[PDB]
Design a binder for this molecule. Structure first.
Ligand code: GDP
Ligand code: GDP
Lengths: 106, 86, 34, 335, 87, 107, 335, 33
């Protein structure tokens, strides 16, 4: 009869998922704002902002691959598009965000 | 059989492939283990090969085995590798 | 049904909080039959 | 588990029934004011006329305002020990000064000159003074406002979606009444939203109305499942607001009470549990205080990482890893 | 409009011409399907598709609407079973 | 910076999901066996077996609706098809399982 | 957190280097034999010739066989106190009888008659006896089998799926060597399965081979993500089997060690953690024993609800709600 | 050199802590002292 321990696990599942989704909302908001800032400044001054942006993506990628939490499509698309972090991807994203791109798209 | 992975302070190298120190460690740390195994799968999958869309010099985009990779066929460096977009 | 009310005693040590708590319940009992 | 040692005495005036709660230790009075068994609807300050006010008379009065003890009556005691009237008049002046600092109307505060001991021994002259006091208990302290009389509030426990009509949210009503057709706000965590009840059920009792007490399901038209979550509240519009920052009065559990072993410092990031959910927050210790020892009470400023519907007086628990490490009350909301 | 009392006769909970058995009523709240009278009313007010009970319980019909399927006796008012439609 | 507490939650999520899936495998196996037994016995003797089968479905329904764990399609289909528990649904399922139905499926 | 107080002394014979682990309390010896920092490759039983064997000399010897201490040497001590040879010959006869009961070959067990005190004080006659003992340490105790020499075993931590090629499983190799092309079994929880490694990587060191020690990723052809899970093991085929039932030696944590407050009884259903995952199990207490107090050692039969790859000697933790409440070793697999 | 883990067991006051000290003292003095 596994139900009593199963219920305990299920309650834990409900609570942790609730919490993760909330955290995801904060990542989403913070990223929308970094994208906005990056698009409003010059390339040199954007570098520490990109460092924060990619650091966040890296954590969201760890969530997806290490812990296997599959997030909403928006965050999934973000994890893909912003995975590559170098001079050449930064040049590309800076340009796109400066021209008014609000969230990473292809 | 066993092929030693060499480390020169900057890169990990083996079988004509290489990864920067930090990128290599990042992949294991993030839950994407065995990056040489992943890259070899791409190279052996008859991959679709195109210029790097971002224009990094020497680099090409390879796609196969469920993954996309940015790779320099001259240096053997894998600059970036991840699963294809869902 | 009579109105219920929660009260309490506060103040510094030895000033008579425990004494007053006892004195209240004793007098009201004697007077009103509480 | 916290431990609170209290004495419960019960007495009756001819009009009202009183439940009196006195505590042996100074530490127990604090534990009780912050995490009452019951909330004091009024308090009896006891000042000796021998000593006048002392260090702890200040502490309890301040706690009163912080906790939200609404009214305070003074029983100036040990008057059998002191003869002169003038000396008393002076002590009463100090006690009113004290109460006035912590926003209790000191000028308008009742003050009974008595002897509790002589009264308990059965001395008619001083027994009158006890009866005078219980007169002020009857007159100065109003009956507290009953739950059902307030503005409507439902903490959300569960959410059940029905396709094409809306979402049903459940929980136990905290105060007030909800009727079908009324507008409600959904407050906390997310940006506030409004909606209309298109259905209510109170478990085993009522259809289209729900009353403080038993569980209620509320059908909100046009609210989709992902737009509401556990830990939010339903409220009559404009009666509760979300906040992230607040001043608190907090009691930190001792180790023997199941709490922390070591003190914490200014970078403590515990969970704060309000009603139906826990939220991470950071803290600001008061000036000079570098650490908080297990077993201490203290005043702290909290900044939550997500807003919570709250008002002054709202109780909360402080948690680490699933264990309760403290208990608090919202003193003053900040923003 | 106004509050309508739910009556309990030991066997059923009844209100607005609907009824649920004691145990089924309690089971629904307990399993995370609250407000069964509200659910059933939604079905009745959704211009539901009405057919005979496929299992053949006597007096009962299958009603479908508002995202739910219900087995309901229009003579007695009893909701015998109600659940969301198949995903 | 929420990442440290976020990681803790994520690790807890990974562990609990792992455990729930295992429990689901046991429910699945136990149900396959009850269905088999019910289909191999007469209606009267099947009643306590049906009581166990529906008790399990009820718990799986609680999982879906109260705690919002969405399981694999097989278990989702089972939660739907076996929700209704009375004499008339039992008569129907007994017949189908006796004729060789191994898992609840639409007519 | 468990607490084990030990003394770690290190000495060298001309051929071998020894790491010696002694403990102050009886309770610490038990705690160490079950959850030792290191596994004893052989033990030094100490019997006084003054007293002969005693209650705990039996306990330690039995624990030896249960834990899997392979060889035992005797140092019959305090011989400076006893004059008579005949009396000693008698004690040695008892000690060999004792060891023989718990399946240690008592007849050809080495037994050194010495004085540890006289030897430590620097008395040449009794120092020879210490040197005799360390001769038997060199000769009677073989070097244990090194990890890398055994059959291959990898507990699975994480799984990463690659489309069209297979699944990569990671973990830290426990023993043995895995090379590309070798067949492997996946054991535990589910029905066993076989597969072939089509790729290996040992973190920072090797491609297509992996060695006990650092983390390894193993690509299994044809294994899909849902067919493997954390908590299973990869193993050389036919070298490890899944089991649900086993005899254990277990130490239950005290309350002060972070464990239980109250004893448990025969209907205890805790979680048992093996290598990388916890699985629920039921227990059978031994004859007469109705309860187990926090702080006790006990021998118990465990029945898991899901099979786990295991062999005798496998250590495990006992958990309740996420907290460690005990530690154990698999004494005897049953089925 | 070959590494080996050993330990001392037995009843209270029989000389386990003493023997542990005596072993390390003698071998030190004899072999490579
Ligand atoms: N003379 C005199 N002594 C009093 C009076 N009230 C309290 N006391 C004394 O104060 C002492 C301690 O008071 P107590 O009831 O413990 O106050 P608490 O410390 O606040 O609980 C008792 O021993 C009493 O004798 C009073 O009205 N007159
Ligand atoms: N005569 C004699 N006494 C000993 C010897 N070894 C230990 N003792 C006595 O035993 C006491 C405690 O011994 P100890 O090493 O703590 O034994 P343990 O309890 O097994 O650790 C000491 O005070 C000694 O007097 C020995 O070889 N000869």
């Amino acid at each position: 009869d596994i139900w009593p321990e199963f219920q305990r696990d299920l309650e834990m599942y409900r609570d942790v998922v609730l919490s993760i989704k909330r955290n995801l909302r904060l990542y989403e908001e913070c990223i929308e704002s970094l994208v906005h800032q990056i698009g409003s400044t010059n390339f040199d001054n954007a570098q520490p902002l990109f460092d924060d942006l990619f650091r966040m993506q890296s954590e969201l990628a760890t969530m997806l691959y290490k812990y296997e939490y599959k997030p909403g499509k928006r965050i999934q698309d973000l994890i893909y598009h912003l995975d590559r972090d170098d001079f050449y991807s930064r040049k590309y994203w800076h340009k796109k965000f400066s021209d008014g791109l609000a969230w990473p798209e292809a | 059989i066993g092929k030693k992975i060499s480390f020169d302070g900057d890169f990990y190298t083996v079988d004509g492939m290489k990864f920067s120190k930090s990128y290599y460690e990042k992949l294991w740390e993030q839950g994407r283990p065995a990056p040489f195994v992943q890259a070899r799968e791409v190279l052996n999958s008859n991959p679709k090969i195109e210029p790097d869309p971002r224009g990094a010099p020497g680099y090409l985009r390879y796609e196969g085995a469920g993954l996309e990779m940015i790779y320099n066929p001259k240096t053997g460096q894998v600059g970036h590798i991840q699963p294809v977009k869902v | 049904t009579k109105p219920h009310v929660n009260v309490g005693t506060i103040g510094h040590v030895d000033h008579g909080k425990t004494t007053l708590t006892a004195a209240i319940t004793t007098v009201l009992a004697k007077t009103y039959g509480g | 588990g916290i431990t609170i040692n209290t004495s419960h005495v019960e007495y009756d005036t001819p009009t009202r029934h009183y439940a009196h709660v006195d505590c042996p230790g100074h530490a127990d009075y604090v534990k009780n004011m912050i995490t009452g068994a019951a909330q004091m609807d009024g308090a009896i300050l006891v000042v000796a006329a021998t000593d006048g006010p002392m260090p702890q008379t200040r502490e309890h009065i301040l706690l009163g305002r912080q906790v939200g003890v609404p009214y305070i009556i003074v029983f100036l005691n040990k008057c059998d020990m002191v003869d002169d009237e003038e000396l008393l008049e002076l002590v009463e002046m100090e006690v009113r000064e004290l109460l006035s600092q912590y926003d209790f109307p000191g000028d308008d505060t009742p003050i009974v000159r008595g002897s509790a001991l002589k009264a308990l021994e059965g001395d008619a002259e001083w027994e009158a003074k006890i009866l005078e006091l219980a007169g002020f208990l009857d007159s100065y302290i109003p009956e507290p406002e009953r739950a059902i009389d307030k503005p409507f509030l439902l903490p959300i426990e569960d959410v059940f979606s029905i396709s094409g009509r809306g979402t049903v949210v459940t929980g136990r009503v905290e105060r007030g009444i909800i009727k079908v057709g009324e507008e409600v706000e959904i407050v906390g965590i997310k940006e506030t939203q409004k909606s209309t009840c298109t259905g209510v059920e109170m478990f085993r009792k009522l259809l289209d109305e729900g009353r403080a007490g038993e569980n209620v399901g509320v059908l909100l038209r046009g609210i989709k499942r992902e737009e509401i979550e556990r830990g939010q509240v339903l409220a009559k519009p404009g009666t509760i607001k979300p906040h992230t920052k607040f001043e608190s009065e907090v009691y930190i559990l001792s180790k023997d009470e199941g709490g922390r072993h070591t003190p914490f410092f200014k970078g403590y990031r515990p969970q704060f549990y309000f009603r139906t959910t826990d939220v991470t927050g950071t803290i600001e210790l008061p000036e000079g205080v570098e650490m908080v020892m297990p077993g201490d009470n203290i005043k702290m400023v909290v900044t939550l990482i997500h807003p919570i519907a709250m008002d002054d007086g709202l109780r909360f628990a402080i948690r680490e890893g699933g264990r309760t490490v403290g208990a608090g009350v919202v003193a003053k909301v900040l923003g």
